[PDB]
From Swiss-Prot:
<dbReference type="GO" id="GO:0005788">
    <property type="term" value="C:endoplasmic reticulum lumen"/>
</dbReference>
<dbReference type="GO" id="GO:0045766">
    <property type="term" value="P:positive regulation of angiogenesis"/>
</dbReference>
<keyword id="KW-0333">Golgi apparatus</keyword>
<dbReference type="GO" id="GO:0005783">
    <property type="term" value="C:endoplasmic reticulum"/>
</dbReference>
<dbReference type="GO" id="GO:0045944">
    <property type="term" value="P:positive regulation of transcription by RNA polymerase II"/>
</dbReference>
<protein>
    <recommendedName>
        <fullName>Myeloid-derived growth factor</fullName>
    </recommendedName>
</protein>
<dbReference type="GO" id="GO:0001938">
    <property type="term" value="P:positive regulation of endothelial cell proliferation"/>
</dbReference>
<comment type="similarity">
    <text>Belongs to the MYDGF family.</text>
</comment>
<dbReference type="GO" id="GO:0001525">
    <property type="term" value="P:angiogenesis"/>
</dbReference>
<dbReference type="GO" id="GO:0051897">
    <property type="term" value="P:positive regulation of phosphatidylinositol 3-kinase/protein kinase B signal transduction"/>
</dbReference>
<keyword id="KW-0732">Signal</keyword>
<dbReference type="GO" id="GO:0005793">
    <property type="term" value="C:endoplasmic reticulum-Golgi intermediate compartment"/>
</dbReference>
<dbReference type="GO" id="GO:0043410">
    <property type="term" value="P:positive regulation of MAPK cascade"/>
</dbReference>
<dbReference type="GO" id="GO:0043066">
    <property type="term" value="P:negative regulation of apoptotic process"/>
</dbReference>
<dbReference type="GO" id="GO:0005615">
    <property type="term" value="C:extracellular space"/>
</dbReference>
<keyword id="KW-0053">Apoptosis</keyword>
<comment type="function">
    <text>Bone marrow-derived monocyte and paracrine-acting protein that promotes cardiac myocyte survival and adaptive angiogenesis for cardiac protection and/or repair after myocardial infarction (MI). Stimulates endothelial cell proliferation through a MAPK1/3-, STAT3- and CCND1-mediated signaling pathway. Inhibits cardiac myocyte apoptosis in a PI3K/AKT-dependent signaling pathway. Involved in endothelial cell proliferation and angiogenesis.</text>
</comment>
Length: 147
């Protein structure tokens, strides 16, 4: 009441399974599944990795974010393709990091040219991506076509 509707980000962990097989993941936050964040990717390797993903929404339910990160800050997996698609809102800002900062070492962000950002989904750029993925941040504003 006095607080004015207060909520906290939701974090869900999942397994990354290599082998050149395309996999899809998704999560719904809030009643009515108003906010949906989907993450589909294909990697090559023989080692499983646990990735953390967190979703957040604004007080007025006007803005939400979808963040995926590596607990160790780096991914040994070899990425051949990836895509992030969201529903219930439009993508305003997207960013990815090749390698996370370790103490003295600074962060290594990915060049815009290396990936493509569209109003409905974000897909990698072929011949530009270095096959490195560590952290993804997506910021979107709630909006509906209304038919």
């Amino acid at each position: 009441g006095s607080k004015g509707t207060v909520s906290e980000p939701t974090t869900v962990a999942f397994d990354v399974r290599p082998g050149g097989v395309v996999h899809s993941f998704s999560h719904n936050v809030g009643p009515g599944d108003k906010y949906t964040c989907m993450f589909t990717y294909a990697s090559q390797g023989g080692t499983n990795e646990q990735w953390q993903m967190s979703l957040g929404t604004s007080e007025d339910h006007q803005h939400f974010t979808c963040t995926i990160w590596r607990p160790q800050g780096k991914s040994y997996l070899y990425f051949t393709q990836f895509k992030a698609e969201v529903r219930g809102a439009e993508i305003e800002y997207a960013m990815a990091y090749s390698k996370a900062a370790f103490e003295r070492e600074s962060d290594v962000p990915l060049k815009t040219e290396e990936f493509e950002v569209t109003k409905t989904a974000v897909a990698h750029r072929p011949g530009a991506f270095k096959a490195e993925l560590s952290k993804l941040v997506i910021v979107a504003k709630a909006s509906r076509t209304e038919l």
